[PDB]
């Protein structure tokens, strides 16, 4: 059952009583391909695999996100080919390339320009802020007459160990991506690193922010439950589950 925005602080405090039992029980309850993004296969190896990406519904439209991993080098062409096919104009990346000295994602975009398969990609602008970067790319594809423009919103401030201490920076980032992504747009391609749960947190916040604005209620439990069925994009810790509540609370002031 959904929680009225007016009752959300009460709800959170009740879920925190008895040493946080309510959050623990609800998070653990989540634990015990139709929505795959289709790409036409290309002349190559008949045995070649295809990029794994899944559609996720948003509050206002179906297939609002494509959730995927940061592409391995052998999947970088299929990644940009999917961006092209889907007319994606916003990518969300929620990891540094390197965190605590460990490679979390390989750079899949040019510093200047490069060609991947039949797609030429040029970096046309970088906007660097304290907690995120906006990179603007132009794509050209052999046989096609016009550029396709893509913005990558790269959040750099997520702690390696846990959730952000305050939600304020992430909420500003989400607000920026929403304001930059037309209703005209294709799906938002979103990735982090394998098994961090950050993509799932972002998606739930994106959807619940819209639901709070439009209905004055939030239904985080059923949103996350739906997210289990759709992908390996699953909230990885009880702390993340609580943080989703703390972040929506802040956005509702
Ligand atoms: Cl294609
Ligand atoms: Cl980085």
Numbering used by the authors: 872 to 903, 926 to 1146
Pull verbatim passages from the article behind this deposition.
PTPRU possesses evolutionarily conserved sequence changes to key catalytic motifs including non-canonical WPD (WPE) and pTyr recognition loop sequences (GSRQ rather than KNRY), as well as a unique threonine in the PTP loop.
The most striking difference is the absence of an ordered pTyr recognition loop. The conformation of this loop is highly conserved in classical PTPs, but in PTPRU-D1 this loop is arranged such that the sidechain of T1089 is in close proximity to the active site cysteine (3.0 Å between T1089 OG1 and C1085 SG atoms, Fig. 2dii). A threonine at this position in the PTP loop is unique to the PTPRU-D1 domain and the more common hydrophobic residues at this position (Ala, Val, and Ile) are not capable of forming an equivalent interaction. This new loop orientation blocks the catalytic cysteine and would directly interfere with pTyr binding. This conformation of the PTPRU-D1 PTP loop is not induced by oxidation, it is instead present in the reduced form rendering the enzyme unable to bind pTyr.
